Design an enzyme around this catalytic site. Structure first.
Site, PDB file in Angstrom:
ATOM      1  N   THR A  40       0.823  -1.201   0.000  1.00  0.00           N
ATOM      2  CA  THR A  40       0.000   0.000   0.000  1.00  0.00           C
ATOM      3  C   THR A  40       0.860   1.255   0.000  1.00  0.00           C
ATOM      4  O   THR A  40       1.819   1.356   0.754  1.00  0.00           O
ATOM      5  CB  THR A  40      -0.940   0.033   1.222  1.00  0.00           C
ATOM      6  N   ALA A  79      -7.887  -2.568   6.095  1.00  0.00           N
ATOM      7  CA  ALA A  79      -8.899  -1.927   5.261  1.00  0.00           C
ATOM      8  C   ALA A  79     -10.224  -1.794   6.000  1.00  0.00           C
ATOM      9  O   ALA A  79     -10.870  -0.741   5.945  1.00  0.00           O
ATOM     10  CB  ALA A  79      -9.085  -2.708   3.962  1.00  0.00           C
TER      11      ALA A  79
END
EC number: 3.4.25.1
Lengths: 204, 220, 123, 213, 214, 199, 202, 201, 202, 199
Positions: free
Chosen positions: H1, H49
């Site tokens: 990420t 997430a």
């Protein structure tokens, strides 16, 4: 965990009178990419190739030691090694380290010298050989490669269909693996010529 | 893995499935698990596949040397003794589980051999992850001095039970019938599972794959 | 644990306890607020000067924060309770929001506290 | 020691079309190297426009499907209307996050129709992180199915190939073929394949045999 | 219950045309010791439902107490509604899952057999709350030793008569005696049919030991 | 690791702190203020576990300002230091312990300047000079060597500069800039940052 | 596993169950745990099957060579000493409890226990294995001096049957061996031949 | 990420990749890691997430309630303080969240880094995630407060692209958002392959 | 510890050893492990002394209050149920194996086993404690239906003596209690009164 | 953690390394050379476990110089890199493993410039540029962004300066000075240290 330290993916596939072997090209350490042209497929003859996945240090060590033994074999016997004999030699080399194993899983693709019958095989890290008639995979994305190859492989493919099949299998399998990719190299071995190609691939 | 063996009135029937899994994924759909030891002695293998192959190859080589030296047919007891002494000296680190079956001058013999070096001489044995299903079949249906066809059906039934109830077993049934007069290596003996018929046609066409570089080396 | 309903509706629609609290307010000393252009002025009557009392202790005008102050009429001790609660609210607002309160915010808080005391058991 | 989880296997797949959604699953319930049963569908009809597929720990799957049915009935009672697919996905996200520290070990895929009548697929992780996708696979064989769905539905890594809309018959063929390929290699995928097709006509069910080993 | 003390071994169940048959040996093992050799691991729930349990026997006795009380209460209501076997199976699943979610499981694997409205019911509930229905069932080592035989027979013959089912259960009990070190050769067979629940025992399998001379 | 330093003069307290906020190997922030103004003449300098530091410091700040509003006068630096220690000690054995190391610098109109050291265990000490961090190991001896009780504020600033230069020379961490404040009878004054700019 | 040996005036009686387990699975239900070491010398084995089989093979080899060299029938004590040396030397690697029983011209019938750890003791009778704990009281209350061969066979059969009924690691058939000067007589008690003790009900 | 944000004269630039992995397996290439909290606040998704999505949805709910109660939009500093206070109650319980709260309030453009470990810092530029070191390298070289809008877009895209090139866990697409005074706009979503064809070629 | 109880036609016989150890040290050599719960109801206790003493006190309290309320002699099954509820509810905190034996007008002589874990079973006879493993075979071979009170007392004394000779955690004296309708008769076997079984030598 | 960097140009290799030797929190040395001259045109840069680095590097240096003495010609950089990898790999599974990370920079009269990366596992890679350390995470992307194969040595030095300035800006460790060398057809040349002297 140890086998996944550097990533990597190798695949071999059988055609009608031809073989294909493909590998990803990334060399990296855990999440960090270092280079994008690491060699994983080594020629062991005019029509014989071995692809190595696993620890990059053991990839290089096993390729070099196999080249040592193969050169000695081909000097003592004035002939080229057969793919089955190469598989047995690799298995012996791996089993010599049964308790201190090399962390590589080889894949062998070739044509029989003087016969040109396609041969593919894979070995585990301690040298248990597995000969198949359709495809072999090795590396960190074997589940994805199995999905692709089981779906796409067909018997008696001509070399162009074989190239397309192994290319699509490798590309879509490594697109779905984090630590493999950064390009794919494919070798198509026929009896009269060898074709090497690099595929257009994602670089993320 | 399901491997099994029985003693019938004229000899030995060995059987195995042909699935080799890596983790929970089928790696080999057609794995040969019945290993040549000598023209009258065979061995099914379970456990660590590399250990099984290497141990059976070593014992087969040593027994060939022994039979060349003596000029006589190998005995199953010799193979059993060599295997158990080798496995014991390694203290279970060589993970070979073996079903060793043969017919020698003394008759048919069947042994189970465990990785730590213990052996059992029995009229029927099973081994592997499907061994309990095959054993259930044997305990339900085994009878002494069966005929060859009866023994083949019984061993195929035991292997099928392993195949249809153990997740680590599958694909084909392989048999090896040994008697004093013949050896039948039936591979495959049965094909109870086949890949499902394809309902569609994946797009796989020339030109689908883009190529950066190309190099053609012509071979002489 | 005292759970009596003290403020209830009368047959004419009235809350007699609220009206009596208003009558308590009407007995307090006069307070006047005038809002100017650049200034706000508060002024409180002292109903009697004892001539012996410390003035600082009986002030009817107090600061809730740097930018907010209030005067009151009615019961002095209730006013002390309300003022302390508002001061705690102003500090907590400076903490959770990185700015001082608007006058309307602390007014809303005080009004809602008073309303809660018109509609809760035992008070 | 006591582990409150078990790995029960099973694969769920969903594909969203222009006016349809497909949710398909294998019907094998297993534990360890054994098979509990060969008739255990992982697809549950939620509404006439919504189906859910759940894989993972079977105890959690049963409990969660019952909780979802209860919540749908409660919503219908409170709001006098049935829940849409998107609202169901948002609610499922909240339900899964409510056990953030002792999670449901369930992979959920919702297939349905949106309010415009278009196919919609929502994929969830065990703690409720979710997104809308055109297609998705979850469960034991998800890494086997996903690259081929990318190649065939998404047309990834292919050049000079048109992006024709995915019709219902081609989607059905692709689902069946991909599950046969998965049954080849994944020890947990087998026995039978249940396919639920959601269109504006309703939900249609189909069963396709798979190999029993 | 993280550590089960006295435990029962495999329980078998099998559907047949007109009812369900369940078998369980009468042994309470204390580790490897066969401490209690005359305990019933089958209970009648009501006229349509019977239950057999493997695992911790004290947890099974607790569940027997709770279920018996629930059935008594419902019969007290006297309103013409009784728990179906499916309802018992659902309640058991909920109870096991609730105990599992409190990290205080009931250490049992239960087979629920029933016959209601002309329909046979066979259900499995384990201690994690995994529950399912199947035409034949076997807990513990029976899952590895009896279930393949039951499945093979049901594969070549989906619908069994009561006599065939009983014979098959006898053969499976014999195999379990041969191969399970925690089993005993003294068992009970419970059958639920249109007539209700009937529990027979103690019973023994006929064993053969001629291979000891081979 | 974050650096705090305080030097108490005859009529002032000089404090300095590093301006680095770091996560893993990266300096996320290079102008980070670790000083908290409780009152017109009190500064709280806090380092320690992320999250804990700001939560505890703002809780103390809220309570000190509330005291001023309630009573019309401010807490003295000694009273504030003791209130801080009592709250930290109460939290130490509770369910929400704070892992914070503190300097409290203050000026009292009657008691003069005051400097307090508090470790995360909530032991309170009064010191003529003090420091927090790994860099304290490298500068406390310099302070011991050169400090006198009668040190003027310009000599104090020079001594602080010596300590910070030693930090540049020997400390493995990169700490290039420091915020500097002084408290006296006229309140808190912000001095120029002491910075060591890389080429 | 339950193993037992009893001495009588002219010989010994040995007995064993036939159960070999791997966990709760019975891997061999007709195991032969009575092992001839020499023409009149047997060992009963308990513990790891690999360990006891290996040690018994090694001792058979050594005792046979020794007997050939001396041109003399081996002493039971000599076989017990060989077992003791092997079990003591490798006590950290072996799990083996052995009973060595047999007949000698010089000493008559003899029973020796070599438990885990490698100590050696001669006993009028010895029991061993996991099941032996359940019959300690029974053999203590039942054994008497001067029993004949038939009394010893019945004593061993009863004790083994009781242990097999209680111990989950024991079961199958009872293998018995009577060793005297004339030779070795082996028998198998199976099925209804095994002594029966009614379960107490009500 | 890899997520990044930076302030500059014309507002806040927010950029992210779109890859979610599960070990070595890429679970998704189309994750939306820029959370549109409301028409005036943006957040980022790094760490868990579900954690980021859930707690920033709670933040959106609280911000809307604040606006209803006060007839004023919450400030960026106040919103980030709310989020930090919310997640501090769960410290040590295993929450993993690293996010950037971005907006434009009465104090101008506002950029805050808030993490589950309790950090909350204002700043001019931030990069969060496994690929954030590479993004930091590119962004710092290219950054100035006086960038033009198109130059800022290019800088953000380039930094995310280089991060995806070096970091195994970053890839897919680059999503680009611009927070301006009257709200944010979703600028672009460019696949890393197209970016590669534009940068290498 | 070895505890035992046997039912005969009109009552029960209970027996225990008297040894309480802390490790290998005997902290109490004359322990009384037979505990009256009610006028005709006793418990034998094995396991943690604190746990069994606490549970027996609590059950005595509950049973006495219940008997006063009902104005009826307590049932042995009721006492066993109270013990079972306590031992099952606190199975993770208690180490207690209980035998509950006594006489009822409705049911006669009764023996119940509540082993660790909290299950409850009625048995013709029950044994418990660490020593009980050594006498399983003896009691299996010896027990017969229809024994009188004297036969039951002798059976219990013999079994307890054998266990005490083998088990290092058991020893001391044998405490016996015969419960019938007329009442409770308690006795202590000590010294030469304890049944003797000769050690087998040579 | 210690920083190594190499950039290969069309006819040269530029290498740089940090000059810090640290133990615990203190910079013990500020002019520490991590480069080892195997031959007239080969540099070995080694970082890693203390003791291991110098032992392994000097073993390699001894063997390369011995090769030159025995044979009258030098090892090529590729041969030297492979000899190094083989020795490291042999030691990896032995009783004396070396935990060292290496760059091998060399110039060959026929093959041109060469730069090799070796991790402690002894995987050998050929790279146009490479870096070692935690600081590699902060500078490899800058090298990716600005490097071209045709880069001149002055542009290479400027790019290296960009990387080192990024290390100054963002890296938590204090790395104020770097040794810089360049290898070409004329051998090894020492460039001026790139330094960032703190004020």
């Amino acid at each position: 965990s140890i086998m996944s330290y550097n990533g990597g993916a190798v695949m071999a596939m059988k055609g009608k009178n031809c073989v294909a072997i493909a590998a990803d090209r990334r060399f990296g350490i855990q999440a960090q990419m270092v280079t994008t042209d690491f060699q994983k497929i080594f020629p062991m003859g005019d029509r014989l190739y071995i692809g190595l996945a696993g620890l990059a240090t053991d990839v290089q060590t096993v390729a070099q030691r196999l080249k040592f033994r193969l050169n000695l074999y081909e000097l003592k016997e004035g002939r080229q090694i057969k793919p089955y004999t190469l598989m047995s030699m690799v298995a012996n080399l791996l089993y010599e380290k049964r308790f201190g194993p090399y962390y590589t899983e080889p894949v062998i693709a070739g044509l029989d010298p003087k016969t040109f019958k396609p041969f593919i095989c894979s070995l585990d890290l301690i040298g248990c050989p597995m000969v198949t008639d359709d495809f072999v995979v090795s590396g960190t994305c074997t589940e994805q490669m199995y999905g692709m190859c089981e779906s796409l492989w067909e018997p008696n493919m001509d070399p162009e269909h074989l190239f397309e099949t192994i290319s699509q299998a490798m590309l879509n399998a490594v697109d779905r693996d984090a630590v493999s990719g950064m390009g794919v190299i494919v070798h198509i071995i026929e009896k009269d010529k060898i074709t090497t190609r690099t595929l257009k691939a994602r670089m993320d | 893995t399901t491997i099994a063996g029985v003693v019938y009135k004229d000899g030995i029937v060995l059987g195995a499935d042909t699935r080799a899994t890596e983790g929970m994924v089928v790696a080999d759909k057609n794995c040969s698990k019945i290993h040549f030891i000598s023209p009258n002695i065979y061995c099914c293998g379970a456990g660590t596949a590399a250990d099984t192959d290497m141990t059976t190859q070593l014992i087969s080589s040593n027994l060939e040397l022994h039979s060349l030296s003596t000029g006589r047919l190998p005995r199953v007891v010799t193979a059993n003794r060599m295997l158990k002494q080798m496995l014991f000296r390694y203290q279970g680190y060589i993970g070979a589980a073996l079903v060793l079956g043969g017919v020698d001058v003394t008759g048919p013999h069947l042994y189970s051999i465990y990785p730590h070096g213990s052996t059992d001489k029995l009229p029927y044995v099973t081994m592997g992850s499907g061994s309990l299903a095959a054993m259930a079949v044997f305990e339900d249906k085994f009878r002494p001095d069966m005929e060859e066809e009866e023994a083949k059906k019984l061993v195929s039934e035991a292997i099928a039970a392993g195949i249809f109830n153990d997740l680590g077993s599958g694909s084909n049934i392989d048999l090896c019938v040994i008697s004093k007069s013949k050896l039948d290596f039936l591979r495959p003996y049965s094909v109870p599972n086949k890949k499902g018929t394809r309902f569609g046609r994946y797009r796989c066409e020339k030109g689908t794959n883009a190529v950066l570089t190309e190099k053609v080396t012509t071979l002489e | 644990s005292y759970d009596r309903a003290i403020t209830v509706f009368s047959p004419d629609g009235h809350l007699f306890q609220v009206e009596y609290a208003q009558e308590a307010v009407k007995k307090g000393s006069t307070a006047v607020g005038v809002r100017g252009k650049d200034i706000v002025v508060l002024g409180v009557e002292k109903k009697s000067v004892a001539k012996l009392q410390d003035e600082r202790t009986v002030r009817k005008i107090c600061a809730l924060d740097d930018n907010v102050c209030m005067a009151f009429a009615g019961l002095t001790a209730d006013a002390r309770i309300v003022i302390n609660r508002a001061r705690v609210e102003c500090q907590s607002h400076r903490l959770t929001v990185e700015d001082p309160v608007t006058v309307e915010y602390i007014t809303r808080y005080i009004a809602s506290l008073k309303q809660r005391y018109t509609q809760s058991n035992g008070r | 020691r006591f582990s409150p989880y078990a790995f029960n296997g099973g694969t769920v797949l969903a594909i969203a079309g222009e006016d349809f959604s497909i949710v398909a699953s294998d019907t094998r319930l297993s534990e360890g190297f054994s098979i509990h049963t060969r008739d255990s569908p992982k697809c549950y009809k939620l509404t006439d426009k919504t189906v859910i597929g759940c894989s993972g720990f079977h105890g959690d799957c049963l409990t969660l499907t019952k909780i979802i049915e209860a919540r749908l009935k409660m919503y219908k009672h409170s709001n006098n209307k049935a829940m849409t697919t998107g609202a169901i996905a948002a609610m499922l996200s909240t339900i899964l996050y409510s056990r953030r520290f002792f999670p449901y070990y369930v992979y959920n895929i919702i297939g349905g129709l949106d309010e415009e009548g278009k196919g919609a697929v929502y994929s969830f992780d065990p703690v409720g992180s979710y997104q809308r996708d055109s297609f998705k696979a979850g469960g034991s064989a998800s890494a086997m199915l996903q690259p081929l769905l990318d190649n065939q539905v998404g047309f990834k890594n292919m050049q000079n190939v048109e992006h024709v809309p995915l019709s219902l018959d081609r989607a059905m063929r692709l689902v069946k073929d991909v599950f046969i390929s998965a049954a080849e290699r994944d020890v947990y995928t087998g026995d039978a394949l249940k396919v639920c097709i959601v269109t504006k006509e309703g939900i249609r069910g189909e069963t396709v045999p798979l190999r029993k080993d | 219950t993280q550590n089960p003390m006295v435990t029962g071994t495999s329980v078998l169940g099998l559907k047949f045309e007109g009812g369900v048959v369940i078998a369980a040996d009468m042994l309470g093992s204390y580790g490897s010791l066969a401490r209690f050799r005359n305990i019933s691991r089958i209970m009648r729930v009501n006229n349509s439902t019977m239950l057999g349990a493997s695992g911790d026997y004290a947890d099974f006795q607790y569940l027997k107490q709770v279920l018996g009380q629930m059935v008594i209460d419902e019969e007290l209501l006297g309103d013409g509604h009784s728990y179906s076997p499916k309802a018992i199976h659902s309640w058991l699943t909920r109870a096991m899952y609730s105990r599992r979610s409190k990290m205080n499981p009931l250490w049992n694997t239960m087979v629920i057999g029933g016959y209601a409205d002309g329909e046979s019911f066979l259900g499995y509930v384990d201690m994690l709350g995994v529950a399912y229905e199947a035409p034949s069932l076997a807990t513990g080592y029976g899952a590895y030793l009896a279930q393949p035989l039951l499945r093979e027979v049901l594969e070549k013959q989906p619908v069994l008569s009561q006599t065939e089912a009983r014979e098959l259960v006898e053969r499976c009990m014999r195999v379990l005696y041969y191969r399970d070190a925690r089993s005993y050769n003294r068992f009970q067979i419970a059958t639920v049919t249109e007539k209700g629940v009937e529990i027979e025992g103690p019973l023994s399998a006929e064993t053969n030991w001629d291979i000891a001379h081979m | 690791m974050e650096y705090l330093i305080g030097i108490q003069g005859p009529d002032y307290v000089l404090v300095a702190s590093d301006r680095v906020a770091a996560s893993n190997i990266v300096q996320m922030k290079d102008d980070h203020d670790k000083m908290f103004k409780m009152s017109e003449k009190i500064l709280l300098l806090c380092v320690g576990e992320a999250g804990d530091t700001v939560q505890f410091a703002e809780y103390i700040q809220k309570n000190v300002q509330l005291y001023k509003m309630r009573n019309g006068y401010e807490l003295s630096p000694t009273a504030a230091a003791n209130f801080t220690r009592r709250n930290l000690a109460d939290y130490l054995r509770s369910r929400t312990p704070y892992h914070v190391n503190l300097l409290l610098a203050g000026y009292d109109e009657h008691e003069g300047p005051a400097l307090y050291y508090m470790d995360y265990l909530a032991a309170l000490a009064k010191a003529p000079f003090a420091a927090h961090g790994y860099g304290a190991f490298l500068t406390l001896s310099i302070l011991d060597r050169y400090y006198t009780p009668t040190i003027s504020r310009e000599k104090a600033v020079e001594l602080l500069r010596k300590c910070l230069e030693e930090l540049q020379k020997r400390f493995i961490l990169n700490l290039p800039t420091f915020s500097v404040r002084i408290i006296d009878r006229n309140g808190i004054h912000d001095l120029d940052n002491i910075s060591f700019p890389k080429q | 596993t339950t193993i037992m040996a009893v001495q009588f005036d002219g010989g010994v009686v040995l007995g064993a169950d036939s159960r070999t387990t791997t966990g709760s699975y019975i891997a061999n239900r007709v195991t032969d745990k009575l092992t001839p070491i020499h023409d009149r010398i047997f060992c009963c084995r308990s513990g790891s099957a690999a360990d006891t089989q290996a040690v018994a093979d090694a001792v058979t080899y050594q005792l046979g060579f020794h007997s050939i060299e001396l041109n003399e029938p081996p002493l039971v004590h000599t076989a017990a000493s060989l077992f003791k040396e092997m079990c003591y030397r490798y006590r950290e690697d072996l799990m083996a409890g052995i009973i060595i029983a047999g007949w000698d011209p010089q000493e008559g019938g003899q029973v020796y226990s070599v438990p885990m750890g490698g100590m050696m003791v001669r006993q009028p009778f010895a029991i061993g294995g996991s099941g032996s704990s359940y019959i300690y009281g029974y053999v203590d209350a039942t054994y008497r001096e001067g029993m004949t061969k038939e009394e010893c066979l019945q004593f061993t059969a009863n004790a083994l049957a009781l242990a097999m009924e209680r111990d989950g690691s024991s079961g199958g058939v009872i293998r018995l061996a009577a060793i005297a000067e004339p030779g070795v007589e082996r028998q198998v008690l199976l099925g209804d031949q095994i002594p029966k003790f009614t379960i107490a009900t009500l | 990420t890899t997520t990044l944000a930076f302030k500059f004269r014309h507002g806040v630039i927010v950029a992210a990749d779109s890859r979610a992995t599960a070990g070595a397996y890429i679970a998704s290439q189309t994750v939306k890691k820029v959370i549109e909290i409301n028409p005036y606040l943006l957040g980022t998704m790094a760490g868990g997430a579900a954690d980021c999505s859930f707690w920033e949805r709670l933040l959106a709910r609280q911000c809307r309630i604040y606006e209803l109660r006060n007839k004023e939009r919450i400030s960026v500093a106040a919103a980030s303080k709310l989020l930090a206070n919310m997640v501090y109650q769960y410290k040590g319980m295993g929450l993993s969240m690293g996010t950037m709260i971005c907006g434009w309030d009465k104090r101008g453009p506002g950029l805050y880094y808030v993490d589950s470990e309790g950090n909350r810092i204002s700043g001019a530029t931030f990069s969060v995630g496994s690929g954030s070191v590479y993004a930091y390298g590119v962004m710092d070289r290219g950054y100035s407060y006086d960038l033009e809008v198109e130059e800022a877009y290019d800088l953000a895209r380039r930094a995310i692209y280089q991060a995806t090139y070096r970091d195994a866990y970053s890839g897919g697409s680059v999503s680009l958002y611009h927070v301006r005074e009257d709200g944010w706009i979703r600028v672009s979503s460019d696949n890393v392959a197209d970016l590669h064809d534009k940068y290498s070629g």
